[PDB]
Amino acid sequence: CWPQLRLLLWKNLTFRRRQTCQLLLEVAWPLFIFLILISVRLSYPPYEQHECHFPNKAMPSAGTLPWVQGIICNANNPCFRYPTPGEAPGVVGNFNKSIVARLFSDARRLLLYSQKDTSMKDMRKVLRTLQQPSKELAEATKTLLHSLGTLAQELFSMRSWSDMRQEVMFLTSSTQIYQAVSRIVCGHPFYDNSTTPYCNDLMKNLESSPLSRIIWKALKPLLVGKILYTPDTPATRQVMAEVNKTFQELAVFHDLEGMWEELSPKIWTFMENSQEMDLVRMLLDSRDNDHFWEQQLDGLDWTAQDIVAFLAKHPVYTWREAFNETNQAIRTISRFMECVNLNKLEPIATEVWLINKSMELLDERKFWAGIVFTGITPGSIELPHHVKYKIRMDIDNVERTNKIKDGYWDPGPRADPFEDMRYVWGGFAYLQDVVEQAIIRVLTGTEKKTGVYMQQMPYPCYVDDIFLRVMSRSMPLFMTLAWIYSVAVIIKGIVYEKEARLKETMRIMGLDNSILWFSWFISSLIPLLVSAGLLVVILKLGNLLPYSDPSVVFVFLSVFAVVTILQCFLISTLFSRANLAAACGGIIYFTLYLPYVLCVAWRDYVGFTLKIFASLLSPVAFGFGCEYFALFEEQGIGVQWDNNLTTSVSMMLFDTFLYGVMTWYIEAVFPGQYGIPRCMEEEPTHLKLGVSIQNLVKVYLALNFYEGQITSFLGHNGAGKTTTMSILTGLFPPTSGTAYILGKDIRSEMSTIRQNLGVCPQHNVLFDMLTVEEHIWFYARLKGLSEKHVKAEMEQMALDVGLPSSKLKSKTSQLSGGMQRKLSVALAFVGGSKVVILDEPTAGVDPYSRRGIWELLLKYRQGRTIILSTHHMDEADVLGDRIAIISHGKLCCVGSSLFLKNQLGTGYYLTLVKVSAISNLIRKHVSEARLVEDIGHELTYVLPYEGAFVELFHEIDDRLSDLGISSYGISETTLEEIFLKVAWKLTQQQFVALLWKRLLIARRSRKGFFAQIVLPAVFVCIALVFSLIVPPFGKYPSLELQPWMYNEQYTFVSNDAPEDTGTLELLNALTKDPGFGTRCMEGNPIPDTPCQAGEEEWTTAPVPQTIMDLFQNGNWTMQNPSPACQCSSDKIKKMLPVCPPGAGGLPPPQRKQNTADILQDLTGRNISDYLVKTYVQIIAKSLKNKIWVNEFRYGGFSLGVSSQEVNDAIKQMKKHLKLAKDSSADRFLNSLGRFMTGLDTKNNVKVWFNNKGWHAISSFLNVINNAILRANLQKGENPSHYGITAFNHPLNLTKQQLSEVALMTTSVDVLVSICVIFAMSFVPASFVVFLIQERVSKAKHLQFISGVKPVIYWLSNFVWDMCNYVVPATLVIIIFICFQQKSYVSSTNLPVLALLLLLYGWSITPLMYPASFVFKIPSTAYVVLTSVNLFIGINGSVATFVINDILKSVFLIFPHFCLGRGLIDMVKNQAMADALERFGENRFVSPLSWDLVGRNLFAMAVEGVVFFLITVLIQYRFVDRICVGIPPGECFGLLGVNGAGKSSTFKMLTEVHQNMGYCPQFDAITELLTGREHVEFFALLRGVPEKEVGKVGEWAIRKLGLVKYGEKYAGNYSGGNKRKLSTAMALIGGPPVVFLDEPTTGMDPKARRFLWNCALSVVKEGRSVVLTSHSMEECEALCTRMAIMVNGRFRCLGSVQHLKNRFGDGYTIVVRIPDLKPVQDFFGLAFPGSVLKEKHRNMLQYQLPSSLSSLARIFSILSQSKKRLHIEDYSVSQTTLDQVFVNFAKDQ
């Protein structure tokens, strides 16, 4: 058992080693694939990003100055990496150090001090009293001194103007300006025709200044934009007037220039020539006032000396420089604010005019967003209590509304300042908040009393390694390609071993399929394990899968190799061709891998039971395991032994078991064309009996085979000798019979029988890539011989074979057919087998190797029980010692050759070579004589039988010169007799005939290649159906801003400073009956979301034993309230950090708010740390369960706490000091007072928003605005039906975006075009494979032999190919015109596409014609042509992606590229015309224009023409004195030596064409055509009449027989029937000379005689024939004038008898008498040339050379010694023709 496994493994290893061409590619392909993989890996490094927070943005309602400050500097998401103070629950600042805020606060302080100041009036009163020592003078002076000291302190304590002037002077190197502006504004981390060109050049410089050009993108729609709204309802007018007030709040700088121009001369003369200033300067310099100023300064800067130097200066810094600087600053700020359009309000009547005006303003490049209301009628009614409004803005400034989420999840806070922040810099949130605040103010009356801020939630220290994810979630493809190559190789090997019938012989040799499958398994698993180990090595070292144990991945790859090995064992039993299976395995495994990518996209609704029932394949389970590996690898923890993956391994093992069972079943139920689906002479007792059959029978005989005799076994192959020989072997069991083979019953023991019983079937067994010595060694080891015994047997076999040389012993299977057959028949004798069963030896080999094999067989006659079974007569005659014939399953005759020939055989055959005279002489010499047959220069007679022989031969030899007889001959009866006795318009005719034949061969192929019609149909159907799934990619529907667009989310509300001031009522109205927003309130005014009504429970989730450790780890202050968390340590790359328990610290109270979501109170908790830890831990827990984790929370609120005095003070100040009512003084003061009172906020809210949700910030802003509105509502009936809804609907796209979408749709266009190109390329594949089938010596050369004019052949082929491509063209046209694809079904795009497909077919059908020329194998050009067509399609797709002019000019040669570009340009022009019609114009550029489409049509047409021409061109490519005369009726058989070039001479020697007929050596018939139609087509091509064609066909079908099977498929016939059809084809036209070649190959008796009779008859009609073969019996029975060709020249010619007598050997005699030596002694003494050819018991044979002319005396001596030697039987024969042939071949 095990030794056989060892031999099988050795054979497999030798097959692997000797190739030296497959294993190197096998080891290089995975290396190359994964080298490309690692090269791609080393190009994308892992991106690490620290955790950070984002500053809070301020809306316009929270103050104009903080809003502008938030716009200006902190507009980039700086990613602080540390919690900003803005995220603190109490403070909302971060502008502590803002010098502008300090300047404004100092200005407010100066104002409020001046209005409460009395120094001016006190100084005036003191001056009046002094002008009108004293008593009250001292008190007045003291009060004035104190007042002026306080004023000096106040004026010096501002400290803001100093920094402002220093910074503006330093500004008037790249980073210094940025640092200065950042320190100034906040803390520390064609247009020239419209307006004046000054600020045009300013904005040009802003766009060209080398800084972050993002602040300009945010400031452009703010100071240049322009808004417009719905019809002029008075309430809409009121809300727009409120918005206008909010806008003009910042217009204080507009009327400041007039104020300065009006106040400058007054303050100038006040500081120049006023008595008050002179008195102040006088009092500032004294002897006692200096100490007063020193005491009042409190040691501050700007002492009294500096004050006196600055103020008192009539002619180094006085007030004049400050005055000039302030004047210049005012000039600059006025010139800046001049072109700032603060009147951006335009009322519009209708919505269509709204859209038109917005588009016009967009063309004018000055257009901000636009509000659209929903008023019911232009009435004075205030509001319908529920405002629905939309904000229409440009697309490039608003986030798209077609999607609300990125889809696939990926780490990253999504905080890019420009790419995904359009709701901030675009101005959407600003206008939204302004409109909501205006609506709130107009509904109730409260002005602002509310601030709003936006805070982005932080992110917990993530890293970006998307490449690792996409490569570990798509591992199977590149993990499987190399094994696809490996499985193709192993399938090629398996099917090659199975096709050659080697497995059948292995089974016959005494083996079971189990050990073969095991050996194949081991031999294919060893290199797969090697490759798996190497891949584990290259993956671990590649740094692409760190922290992954090599052992577990190695075991995984080993199980994968095992399951793929069993899968290929499954797939191999369905194919019976090596290359076909090797090419189809790859595509079949690709098809089996596709379900994985098909199921991975629909993972949202896939069931575990569906996963199991779909895991019946190997690639899907491997992909699941790889997904497990990826999920456990991405987080850095790796994969280890931790007890999914186990389920995947179990499913893979179940798949292995299922594949094994499927193999075990299919190998038995459906095998190949060779498997089995589930007058008796004296018996010589001188030798031992080896095989004794006894009463053998089957389902609808007894012989005794002996040891030393080579017994023959003849039969009709239908009545026996086929199932009897199989029953003698182990193929089929017996049926009520027994046969003791060498003393062992067949049914008793079959193992010991096969141990000493060789076999040699017709199909030789010789493995390729091996030596004959290794063959003998392997067969001897399989026999069971020892080492020394095997060596001795190999030496003996090499000595007896005849090739004892290293040039042949160490060479591969390269010898000629002769030595190959000799070695194959000698192999059956290795091991010393005592019983051998041959089958058809020397079937089609030359007579020389036949004699050699005969000698080799006779050398093994010393007791081996050779059982011959052949259809040849001479072989079984000269080899068979006991001929036995059976018929009707019963034994008929048995005995020696002489016994069978003299018991029932006819008399002698006497021939004469060159008629009534000789006939009468023979009749007078012998009465029972007759004239058998007379041929050209020959005559035969029969002597049916004895002294008449002597007298007749004497009379013949005496009167020989009388007649024309030149030589005589005598022969015995051959065994074949005993076997038979016992059991012009011709061009149009050829055109229509070819068309008819091809039409029939296409019609009768319904079961055949009919898929070439429905397969392109189903593929184009799949394509056009998939084309109806991709969205139009250019739509933006009306989206409603509501936070519940996401299914589930966690909200939260944090109430800071709970003192009931202004926050408690707001937070209450946020969580009352109306809920969060507009979800459900007296109905559900939101579609597809009715709110869950019943839930009210303020509870805390059950906490595990972590509160314990939280208690024992006390002192958890506000700072560090929870244990820390580590992330991204060195050499440990973690996608998301892992934190210990107690991440948040305490589960907050959870409660549902009846809106399909749950809120948790976060009062007094650190919001940032809690959010970070909860988010990271929840995301980890969610991704742990393989759910494709989505987002968790989106938004929350933090409500906290941060006037008329300044307004009243400004009013009182304006009342005095030269009050007036001009448009320069009152306007500026009122605007400044409004700006001052529009900056204070009592209470505020901070909306925490996640940016992963595209529509989260706006929805939560709407929610908080609705909450504010419902809270500010007073004494209402109920807050239910009071609410606002915000919509987002962009405007229509313009020409630019239309061009962009027409450019980006080309991807889907080429995607749908590629599959059509692939599906349309399957029609010419059938044509080319049919041409290949007809090209290999079948019909092309045969039709070329007759007059066919080969150009007409290709012409008719092209015609039918066009006519047959017409059908699927119209079919697919109808199929995908049924679909409403306006790009194709239009009245202007249908004919162009129609003739585009037509010309594509016309150009593609001749392109694959020359590919059939050099291709000597059928049924495999299909796959390679499909592959190269796919490659051309990929090339055309790449060229379309894109020097382009020459590219599109030279790439028009490929018709696939032509059709692709045609479809692309067609859909492009369709989309362009549709867009132009949408915009309101009309373009009618026809697709048939020469430049666009039509150049491709002409190119494809001329390409088809030139391809047909070059195909015609390729076909045309632009012996020693052979002399013989063939008269009428001369069968001039021209034999030759081995390799004499008979086929070449036949092809050279072949009006003359029409006068010659050919019969191919190989069968030539269409497998799907009919029998009668073959000869009908060949008669049509011969030149017979159209009406007599049926008569000629009937004559041809009746002449050669087979009339019972005349109407059937030629492919379903047999060898004899195929040869009959072939020889009938050569007579359908009736030429004078018919050239035949091997008419009988593998045929049977009672059928060869039929063809021989037909040949003799067609010769007898005066028509000479010419044939050649190897069987010399056929030549001697058919030919009449031989022509032997030794080396190029005719070495011998003449009749058969003349050649047999001239150069032939002597006669041969056989005598029959235990025995006596005296008879042999007398026989040897009688003849001098007697030679003992064979000596047996009671039977002798001898040869007489050079003594044939004395046959009369030979017969006389025989008749004399008949009574003396007591001989029982005599026989005398002449030398056969095969002896003459082997003699001529020996002396060469």
Ligand X SMILES: *[C@@H]1O[C@H](CO)[C@@H](O[C@@H]2O[C@H](CO)[C@@H](O)[C@H](O)[C@H]2NC(C)=O)[C@H](O)[C@H]1NC(C)=O
Ligand Y SMILES: *[C@@H]1O[C@H](CO)[C@@H](O[C@@H]2O[C@H](CO)[C@@H](O[C@@H]3O[C@H](CO[C@@H]4O[C@H](CO)[C@@H](O)[C@H](O)[C@@H]4O)[C@@H](O)[C@H](O[C@@H]4O[C@H](CO)[C@@H](O)[C@H](O)[C@@H]4O)[C@@H]3O)[C@H](O)[C@H]2NC(C)=O)[C@H](O)[C@H]1NC(C)=O
Binding site for ligand CLR (CB under 6 A): 155-156, 158-159, 161-162, 301-302, 319, 322-323, 326
Among 413, 410, 536, 412, CA closest to 469 = 410
**Three-state secondary-structure class, residue 829:** coil
Partner that binds at residue 156, options ligand NAG, ligand CLR, ligand Y, none, CB closer than 5 to 8 Å by kind: ligand CLR
Two structure tokens written together for 1325:
């594949």
Q: Is 1720 a binder of ligand Y (CB under 6 A)?
A: no
Contact between 382 and 235 under an 8 Å Cβ cutoff? The reply is yes
Partner that binds at residue 96, options ligand CLR, ligand NAG, ligand X, none, CB closer than 5 to 8 Å by kind: ligand NAG
Query: Which of the stretches 81-89, 398-406, 1087-1095, 1306-1314 binds ligand Y when contact is defined by CB under 6 A?
Result: 81-89
Partner that binds at residue 323, options ligand CLR, ligand Y, ligand X, none, CB closer than 5 to 8 Å by kind: ligand CLR
CA angle (407, 410, 413) in 5-degree steps: 105
Cα–chain center distance at 581: 19
Q: How far is the CB of 391 from ligand CLR (least distance, A)?
A: 44
Contact between 1044 and 1155 under an 8 Å Cβ cutoff? The reply is yes
Helix or strand (DSSP H, E) at 127: helix 119-131
Query: How many Å apart are CA 974 and CA 86, to the nearest integer?
Result: 120
The smaller minimum CB distance to ligand NAG, of residues 160 and 1292, is found at: 1292
Q: How far is the CB of 219 from ligand X (least distance, A)?
A: 17
Residues comprising the chain, all counted: 1788
Q: Is 339 a binder of ligand X (CB under 6 A)?
A: no
Give the total of residues touching ligand NAG (CB under 6 A): 6
Site string for ligand X, 225-254 (x = CB under 6 A): ----------------x--x--xx--x--x
- Tell me, what amino acid is at 421? M
Among 1290, 1285, 1281, 1292, CA closest to 1265 = 1285
Q: Is 1229 a binder of ligand X (CB under 6 A)?
A: no
Q: Is 1038 a binder of ligand NAG (CB under 6 A)?
A: no
CA distances from 1458 to 1303, 1453, 1454, 1492, 1559 (A): 19, 8, 6, 11, 46
Nearest-CB residue for ligand NAG: 96
Contact between 1630 and 1658 under an 8 Å Cβ cutoff? The reply is no
Two structure tokens written together for 723:
């199932």
Q: Is 1169 a binder of ligand Y (CB under 6 A)?
A: yes
Cα–chain center distance at 982: 66
Partner that binds at residue 1306, options ligand Y, ligand NAG, ligand CLR, none, CB closer than 5 to 8 Å by kind: none
Among 1237, 1231, 1235, CA closest to 1203 = 1237
User: Which member of 78, 83, 93, 1642 binds ligand NAG (CB under 6 A)?
Assistant: 93
Q: Is 1234 a binder of ligand X (CB under 6 A)?
A: no
Among 1198, 1196, 1203, CA closest to 1242 = 1203
The smaller minimum CB distance to ligand Y, of residues 455 and 1262, is found at: 455
Two structure tokens written together for 159:
């400290």
Query: 118: exposed, middle or buried (C-beta count within 10 Å: 0-12, 13-18, 19+)?
Result: exposed
Q: Is 345 a binder of ligand X (CB under 6 A)?
A: yes
Partner that binds at residue 345, options ligand NAG, ligand Y, ligand X, none, CB closer than 5 to 8 Å by kind: ligand X
Give the total of residues touching ligand Y (CB under 6 A): 9
Q: Is 1476 a binder of ligand NAG (CB under 6 A)?
A: no
Query: Which of the stretches 278-286, 336-344, 479-487, 1115-1123 binds ligand Y when contact is defined by CB under 6 A?
Result: 1115-1123
Q: How far is the CB of 344 from ligand X (least distance, A)?
A: 8
Q: Is 96 a binder of ligand NAG (CB under 6 A)?
A: yes
DSSP 1050-1085: EEEEEE-S-SSSSSHHHHHHHTSTT-SSSSSSSS--
Query: How many Å apart are CA 622 and CA 560, to the nearest integer?
Result: 7
Helix or strand (DSSP H, E) at 850: helix 847-858
Partner that binds at residue 1120, options ligand CLR, ligand NAG, ligand Y, none, CB closer than 5 to 8 Å by kind: ligand Y
The smaller minimum CB distance to ligand NAG, of residues 96 and 735, is found at: 96
User: Which member of 196, 209, 1120, 1653 binds ligand Y (CB under 6 A)?
Assistant: 1120
The smaller minimum CB distance to ligand NAG, of residues 341 and 356, is found at: 356
The smaller minimum CB distance to ligand CLR, of residues 10 and 323, is found at: 323
Contact between 925 and 951 under an 8 Å Cβ cutoff? The reply is yes
Partner that binds at residue 247, options ligand Y, ligand X, ligand CLR, none, CB closer than 5 to 8 Å by kind: ligand X
The smaller minimum CB distance to ligand X, of residues 254 and 400, is found at: 254
Partner that binds at residue 244, options ligand X, ligand CLR, ligand Y, none, CB closer than 5 to 8 Å by kind: ligand X
User: Which member of 79, 120, 297, 355 binds ligand NAG (CB under 6 A)?
Assistant: 355
Q: How far is the CB of 1118 from ligand Y (least distance, A)?
A: 4
CA distances from 73 to 83, 213, 1606 (A): 18, 12, 98
Q: Is 341 a binder of ligand X (CB under 6 A)?
A: no
The smaller minimum CB distance to ligand Y, of residues 1245 and 1667, is found at: 1245
Partner that binds at residue 118, options ligand CLR, ligand X, ligand Y, none, CB closer than 5 to 8 Å by kind: none
Site string for ligand NAG, 512-551 (x = CB under 6 A): ----------------------------------------
Partner that binds at residue 1292, options ligand NAG, ligand CLR, ligand X, none, CB closer than 5 to 8 Å by kind: ligand NAG
User: Which member of 88, 651, 836, 1024 binds ligand Y (CB under 6 A)?
Assistant: 88
Q: Is 93 a binder of ligand Y (CB under 6 A)?
A: no
Among 627, 575, 637, CA closest to 596 = 627
Query: How many Å apart are CA 1333 and CA 1386, to the nearest integer?
Result: 42
Q: How far is the CB of 356 from ligand NAG (least distance, A)?
A: 6
Q: How far is the CB of 1085 from ligand NAG (least distance, A)?
A: 24
Q: Where are the alpha helices (DSSP H) in 509-607?
A: 513-541, 550-572, 578-600
The smaller minimum CB distance to ligand CLR, of residues 155 and 1315, is found at: 155
Residue 38 has phi, psi (to 5 degrees) of -75, -30
Q: Is 613 a binder of ligand Y (CB under 6 A)?
A: no
Q: Is 671 a binder of ligand Y (CB under 6 A)?
A: no
Two structure tokens written together for 386:
């529920």
Q: Is 179 a binder of ligand Y (CB under 6 A)?
A: no
The smaller minimum CB distance to ligand NAG, of residues 50 and 1478, is found at: 1478
CA distances from 1554 to 676, 1550, 1602 (A): 47, 10, 26
Residue 769 has phi, psi (to 5 degrees) of 55, 25
The smaller minimum CB distance to ligand Y, of residues 973 and 1166, is found at: 1166
Query: Which of the stretches 93-101, 150-158, 706-714, 804-812 binds ligand NAG when contact is defined by CB under 6 A?
Result: 93-101
Q: Is 1198 a binder of ligand Y (CB under 6 A)?
A: no
Query: How many Å apart are CA 206 and CA 181, to the nearest integer?
Result: 14
3-state secondary structure 1287-1342: EECCCCCCHHHHHHHHHHCHHHHHHHHHHHHHHHCCHHHHHHHHHHHHHCCCCHHH
Q: How far is the CB of 284 from ligand Y (least distance, A)?
A: 41
Query: How many Å apart are CA 493 and CA 820, to the nearest integer?
Result: 22
Q: Which residues bind ligand Y (CB under 6 A)?
A: 82-83, 88, 1118-1120, 1166, 1168-1169
Q: Which residues bind ligand X (CB under 6 A)?
A: 241, 244, 247-248, 251, 254, 342-343, 345
Q: Which residues bind ligand NAG (CB under 6 A)?
A: 93, 96, 101, 355-356, 1292
